[PDB]
Amino acid sequence: SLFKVILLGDGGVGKSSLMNRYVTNKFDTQLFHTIGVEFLNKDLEVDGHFVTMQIWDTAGLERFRSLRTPFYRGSDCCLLTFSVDDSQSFQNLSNWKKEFIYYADVKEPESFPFVILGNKIDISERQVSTEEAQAWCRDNGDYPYFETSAKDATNVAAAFEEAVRRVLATEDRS
Amino acid sequence: SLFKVILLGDGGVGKSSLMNRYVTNKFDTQLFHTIGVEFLNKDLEVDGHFVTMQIWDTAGLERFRSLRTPFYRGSDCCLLTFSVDDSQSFQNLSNWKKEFIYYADVKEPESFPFVILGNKIDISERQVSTEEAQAWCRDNGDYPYFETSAKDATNVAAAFEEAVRRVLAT
């Protein structure tokens, strides 16, 4: 069966790059800001279960809100993405969760699957630490946290695969 | 293969209304102006030939030129459309013909099939007469001319069928 997962987060944190790394194993330095939404399909096998994952990429910039929000509904799992070199993108997580909850209209937010991604760990000068990110995850839903690099491919595959697990875990919750 | 026929003409002449009337048999008083292009599939028999067709609908408004013109390539017939209650839409037929030829990048553009549609003939107070439209068609390539009403469903299929005959001729 099909699993819709959606990437939300500030402009330029690497949402598109994360998706193109996972689906096409490519990386681009000169990547254009996303205008609205995009999706790609990927077939995978997680824990015996053969699955198609439809990955929804959204524009992070404020002016594209009305473009992306009508595609929140129907997501099985939300990937909140920030950049470790950008403190602002990490401070905004609460806002992105609140926006997803409103527009996808998730009742039972206490159990809906979120997975947090700190991207661009390949950049030396960090602006958000591992522990403070791990702190926020424990306190705002106890979500899985992944430090990723779309540039290096670090933990990218693992992050997406985990989202399917969270969906399988709650789909088996009937 | 798939016959591509495309609708050009001034904003509000009834291009989307003709296509919707022909394909889905609906008509609406307050249609939104087209943003860019649209296409609907349509399959039919013409003179006993089974034909697969793709009707392309384009925006009339000038600011959307850059959205429509990439899609001219590979068109088999062009339907130039005006409203008979709008003499400006009729005067612009030459400008639409030239815009098609410039962007369509067709081999032998002088023998390309155009069909001319004068729409909205349900409106009694006409600004363009049948005779002047026929004079223009005869004098600017000798194209087939159809008076249509999307609203009253007048002569709507006949225009698209003739376009198919012109492609089949080519």
């Binding site: 254009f32 609205g36 | 292009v37």
Partner: peptide, 25 residues
């Protein structure tokens, strides 16, 4: 996928149009 492809092509052209409106503004 020529219908899907064609629709993708239209979507892309609409995104070009927005990209150029926004960069002026």
């Amino acid at each position: 996928m020529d219908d899907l492809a064609q629709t993708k092509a239209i979507k892309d052209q609409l995104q070009k149009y927005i990209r150029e409106l926004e960069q002026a503004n």
